[PDB]
RNA sequence: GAUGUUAGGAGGGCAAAUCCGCCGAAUUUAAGCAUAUAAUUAAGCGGAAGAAAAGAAAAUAACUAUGAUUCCUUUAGUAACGGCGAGUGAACAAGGACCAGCUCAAACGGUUAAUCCUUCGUUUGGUGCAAACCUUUCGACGGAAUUGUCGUUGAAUUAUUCCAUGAAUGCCUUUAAUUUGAGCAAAGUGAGCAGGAAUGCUUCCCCAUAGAGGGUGAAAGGCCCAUAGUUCUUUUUAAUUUAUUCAUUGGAAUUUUUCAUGUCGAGUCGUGUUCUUUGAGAUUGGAGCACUAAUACGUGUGAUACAUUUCACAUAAAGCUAAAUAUAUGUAGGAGACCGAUAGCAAACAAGUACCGUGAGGGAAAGAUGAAAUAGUACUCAGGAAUGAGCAAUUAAAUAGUACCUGAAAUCGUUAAGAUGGAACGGAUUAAGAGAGAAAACAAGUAAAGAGGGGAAU
RNA sequence: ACGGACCAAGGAGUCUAGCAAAUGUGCAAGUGUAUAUGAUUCUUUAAACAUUUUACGCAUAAUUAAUGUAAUAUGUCUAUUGUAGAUUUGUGCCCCACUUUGCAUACAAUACCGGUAAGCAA
RNA sequence: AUUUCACUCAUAUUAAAUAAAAUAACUCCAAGUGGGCCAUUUUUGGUAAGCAGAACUGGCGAUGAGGGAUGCUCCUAACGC
RNA sequence: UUACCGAUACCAAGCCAUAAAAAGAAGAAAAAAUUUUUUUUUAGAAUCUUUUUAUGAGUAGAAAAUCGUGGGGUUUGUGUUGAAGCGAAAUACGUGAGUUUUCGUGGAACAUCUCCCUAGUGCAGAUCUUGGUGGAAGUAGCAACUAUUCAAAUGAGAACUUUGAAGACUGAAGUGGAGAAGGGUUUCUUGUCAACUGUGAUUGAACAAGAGUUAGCCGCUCCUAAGGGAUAGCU
RNA sequence: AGCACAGUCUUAACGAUGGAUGUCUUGGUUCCUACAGCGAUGAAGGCCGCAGCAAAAUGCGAUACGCAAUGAAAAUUGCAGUGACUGAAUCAUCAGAAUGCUGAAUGUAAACUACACCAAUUCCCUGGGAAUAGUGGUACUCCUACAGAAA
């Protein structure tokens, strides 16, 4: 707003959301935490990775939750274990989830995510 | 051309759309250039980025009353207040060479507003904390204890700005001592019809002054 | 403003009798669906606007500074009238008096919330409630144009 | 500002104003002042009279500034001083104004007036008309002449 | 002089919007056209920078005078130029932006070329992990230079200060500004309705120093990025820890006595002539040719040629210089009462692309399924296959099926009704048919029963 | 006589400079704050606001090639003279004739300014 | 000749008649036009012409309606529904 | 001599507009039921209201008042319960540009007439520009190069693919072998038919996947020619 | 099971052709702001190459759709395969390394992958084994030094 240095223009916003690196796309990948874990690591939001455990509040499967399985973000798209759709040729696939959609519940951890965990508090 | 209007004579013959300009930059550049002078006067240290300039009368009878800022004190201006030109272009004084003082009130004008100015100069010291006498007709400088309480006080620009100049175009008179013999359209007159030959016993003046 | 020789970039080609075509100028050469075709031309497609727009036009206007005066009074004057403010779409029914002048304690307190506590207080729910809904999206080309939104006045 | 124009009047009108046997052509008279003397003559002479030929000397190179005089008639005079002065100016018949028009912006003082009767006036000017200076002489007053 | 497969270096070409030189038109206007105008322009040739160029008076003025250049306002469409026709057209003063001034050319060092460059070694310390860089100076060698570099801008003589050090000792703390990169950053994913899906509608709450924008299955301050606001970091630049001594080593600058009243740009100025240029007119500048100066008491301007002469101003024929100024170029940001795919750049896309011309060159057309194809059509039947159909199938939707948003008109097909003797349509007036239609084209109220909606009653 | 096979979309008195007339607006012998400047204005802000006690333009005076000259004229704050003429005053609050006042304007007459003639001209 | 005072020459139908005579007068700005043609009467040149050139008025142009079968100009008559 | 017919002209009346005029800055009327209810109205906008009279062609041309479009401020609205747009329409309004509604389709935005601001603002034409589509019309036409026939195979399908038989042609200056320029993979094998191969097509110089060009002796490379470029100079 | 003549024209409903209209817009345009050149240390431009499957565009240069380093930070995915459970997968930054043939092009040439001359060159370990027909230099003009010859 008042920052003249940063622009507010459609066009130019929309072009940088929709080619925006997946370095910079990782950060739009955001996603709300709960209550408990907002209390417990005193955010409000983080970025989600293939193995967190989320709720999905919006959309046809507004109650369903579980472990996320893959996130791609040219597609801005998280899927989650259990949201699997039938195709028309037969065979099961993943119902995409915009992460905006989602809160998360639960988080891991491994050897990267130990110091994530670190810069994030 | 038809009906009566005035007759045209508008200069747009040659390729003119190339020497069009339309300042949308004007008051961009006005502050822009705020901005500058701002900067500079914030980073010389308190020290004002105006120089002094001398009173002086404008040329031609048009603007013969008027005065303005001219360029530079002459040498004898600067002399008179004590201070050698190279001496004073360092302490916020402008100086040329090119003018001369052709009278006592512009001499005596300008010499008292250089001392004005003079007296407002307060030096600082070079060599960290070293504060000593100056060099050349410049005043002198202080310590410590007064460089920590002088620098934080409110400067002076009206000197700088031009000298404010009151006229009383309005006077009265006692009526006992007007000259009701005056005549001075005549006397404007005779001064013209007379001019040539006085000029010619100027020059005559001039060729017996040449002996 | 447009570009300044837009539609005009090409070769003037106009052999126009005897072609049994109109006397339009023509673009040059073959091999492209481009040649032949009607060149610059107030008409053509791609040809260049009859009167191309240019920067020069007079964008601003002087305004003498007492008649400016003179209408920032009037305004000032105007809304000190009930019925005039009351006419220009505020919803003051239940504020006091119209030339409305508060205690100097407004510009000492900086939050939001107590500013919206003081002009409900006042007796301008009404009119925050109209400002708040008065917002939504534009019709028309102006939304791509950065100015989305149409937000009544307070 | 070009909804008002009076094109937008006849735009259905096929000639747009301009006649159907007459036309608008480009230039039918010629550019400018093409047509002075020869086709343009009646409108030259009967609008612009003396445009053709030249009369007097030249000048080569002017400088305005010297000659640069403005005027002020006598009846302005006492307009020049506030209401309140020359209230108090008029009851005392031992003072007089003296009035200096260059302040002002006046070079040369021009007779065309009235001035009132038995008021001395002293105006101090850069020239002086022989009418203004006996009108002024007239009321008591008296010319001075400045530069 | 030549010559170096000697040592060390430079120039070449691209790029041009602004900028600097040259060269140089015509279309056009004059209602014809020849001077004039277009235009000191376009094209052509050459040369630089972040700006360039100009610039420190051989300047104005005529006044009580101004004081390098550039640019803005104005002078001013004025003085003036011109088949005095069409047209052309400054300068001074005035108000402002900006504002820094300087050095080569002669004197003296001639009881010491005192100057400059090349090369090769040592070291005064240091920010940097490093790489490299800033400082450092004893030199020595080889040259250049007397066919002139630097010391000197007068010299010497008295009267006060400035500039550096070597060494030793303690010493790199703290405020503002400015600026790069990083994080932090309020409040709902509450009912209910309708939905494929809210960000919609009612309703209950809240945050705002954040109600700019963008994304999210529909219109979101409270879902996400962000935005207010703050917190560190980075370039420097105003204020800010710490100076102490010792010492000669010179240098310089400010002010009294004498000299010496010096020097001051030559095929240059200037004049004649020719051409061009200018508003410059018995010639504004430039150029070619011919002639060819004076020495500051000179010579050059003072807008009409000339002779005699006063006055004023300046001190040509050598050079440098930052600011204000300009930028249809490149790059990077930010905006708009601009255009919305025949528009806007030629190009929203694989666009200077495909394609055309031997070549110089010319130069397009072409965007949109859906929220999601991680829903892009599975299965069956008939067909050689294309395809079609379904009792089958994704979707909210397939008459959204990839020639896919909507899907006009021209033109064509199917069905129905009607008309039809060398035009068809039409105006005006009805009649007969065929479609639709109740808002004036009748029934307010009344009493009963069935469902509701409100207002006044504690 | 020429253009028009049909349909869709595009398609032509506009922009700037300068002058005048008309009308609206502000101020008024003045009027226009030019460039510029300042201000805890600085998403929105390239606009709005403002101008430490003679910048310039136009107007305020004309005329002459031009040295230049320059508008009743000091009898007095009545401010040229007529003929029509709006408004006003009264007498015969509303019809009429007389007086009273005499805007704008029209038609003339007068002075006075600049230039040119003519006479005189130290 | 001018001026000022007196007297007074229908003015209560109007210094003859009539008059949708002030729908006047004047000023400013500006469009289009500046190829015309026809009819009656007159007339020039021509053998004559739907020919060439003029005068008056009215029309066609710019204009439809009823009639002349038909017709830019003839007759009647000019036009809101 | 009568009567009749016969105009957008004449006369009477109504209505529209234009022009002009006369005048104007707050109180109960009626009906239907049965005193009590109900029903309508009960007005006051100065470019306005009421009333009156006269008048109304029109090219070129001028003006006024209106009707629309893109976009901007102001006001205050409609939208998933379906906006814009489009097709057909309407006991709809206007005189008219138009405006407003209905149904269908459409699936995401749209107005503002409260007042004003603004412009790239209104098409039947310009042998107009671009795109699309017609009648002509299943028509002109598919005409040089004497010429084909029988049987079989493949294939969904054979006059123009293959094989065999025949009849013929090119005919010693050849639709024969090698040829340069130009072309650039058209060559070969295999597969194949969406389009092309102006009829068909299973063929093909089309399409797809792979492959293919071997030099001491053949040429270039070397030499010099008509000549070109450059060097030194000189302009 | 039967009935309509045909053609031409008109109207309505539904379709075909076509791509208008509306709504969209990672585009254009204009203005403002700021910085500004590159090149013999080989530029701009042009060719030729580089991916597992790879044509164009984009990116890059024999280290060839990317190496190293630094910040973020674990996938690339159309299949394959490769990756941690942070110098590893991918972004961003980009200073180090590398940067084919040309082109001012500069050894001579040029519709040639032709021809020279001088150091035969380069790599291995810190003086002994190899690659080899295979690397650098050599334009014109000019400047400062230097050189041996000359009248």
Redo the contacts with the bound molecule.
Sequence with gaps: ?????????????????????????????????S?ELRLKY??????V???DEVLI??????GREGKVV????????I?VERVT??????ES???????????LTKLKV????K??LD??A | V?????????????????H???????????????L?????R?????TP???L??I?????????????????F?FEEL?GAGL????A?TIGI??????????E??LTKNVERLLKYKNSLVM?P?????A??????IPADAD?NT??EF??KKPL??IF??E????PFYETIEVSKIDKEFLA?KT??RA?LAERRK?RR??????K??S | ???????????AESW?????????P??????????????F????????????????????????????????CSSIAASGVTSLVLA????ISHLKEVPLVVSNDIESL???????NFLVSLGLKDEVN????????????????????????? | ????????????????????????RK??????????????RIN?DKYHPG??????????????????????????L??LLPEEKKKEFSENKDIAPVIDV????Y??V??????????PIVVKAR?????????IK???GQCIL??
């Design positions: 707003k008042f920052n003249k240095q940063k622009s507010s223009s459609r066009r130019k916003m929309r072009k940088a959301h929709f080619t925006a690196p997946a370095g910079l796309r990782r950060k739009i990948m955001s996603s709300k935490l209550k005193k955010t409000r939001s983080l970025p990775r293939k193995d509040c919006r959309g046809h499967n507004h893959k996130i791609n973000r040219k597609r801005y798209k899927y759709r039938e195709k028309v040729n037969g696939t993943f119902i995409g989830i915009h992460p905006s959609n989602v809160v491994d050897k990267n995510r110091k994530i810069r994030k | 038809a009906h009566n209007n005035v007759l045209p004579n508008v200069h747009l013959h040659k390729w003119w759309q190339r069009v300009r339309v300042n949308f930059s004007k008051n961009i550049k006005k502050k822009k250039r705020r500058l002078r701002e900067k500079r914030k980073a010389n240290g308190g980025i105006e120089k300039h001398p002086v009368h404008c040329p031609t009878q048009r603007y013969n009353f008027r005065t303005r800022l001219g360029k530079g002459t002399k050698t030109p190279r001496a272009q402008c100086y040329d060479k090119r003018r001369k003082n052709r009278s009130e512009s600082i070079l060599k960290k904390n070293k000593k006498k100056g060099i050349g007709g410590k460089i920590k620098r934080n620009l009206s700005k031009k404010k100049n009151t006229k359209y404007l007159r013209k000029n100027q020059q005559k003046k001039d060729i002054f040449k | 403003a447009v570009k300044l020789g837009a539609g005009y970039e090409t070769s126009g009798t005897g072609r049994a075509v109109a006397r339009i023509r673009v040059p050469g073959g091999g492209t669906h481009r040649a032949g075709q009607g060149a031309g107030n008409m053509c497609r791609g040809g260049g606007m009859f009167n191309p727009t240019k920067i020069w036009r007079r964008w601003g206007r002087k305004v003498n500074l007492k008649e400016k005066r003179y209408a920032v220009r779409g505020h919803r900086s939050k939001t919330k107590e500013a919206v109209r400002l708040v809904k008065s917002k939504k999206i534009r019709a028309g080309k102006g939304k791509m144009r950065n100015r989305k939104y149409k937000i009544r006045n307070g | 500002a070009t909804r008002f124009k009076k094109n937008r009047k006849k735009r259905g009108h096929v000639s747009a104003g301009h006649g159907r046997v007459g036309k608008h230039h039918p008279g010629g550019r400018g002042k093409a047509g002075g003397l020869h086709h343009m030259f445009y053709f030929g030249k009369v007097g000397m030249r000048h080569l190179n002017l400088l305005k500034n010297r000659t640069y005089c403005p005027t002020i008639n006598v009846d302005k006492w307009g260059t302040r002002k912006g070079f040369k021009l007779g065309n007036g009235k001035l009132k009767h038995n008021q020239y002086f008309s022989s009418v203004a200076e006996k009108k007239a009321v008591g400045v530069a």
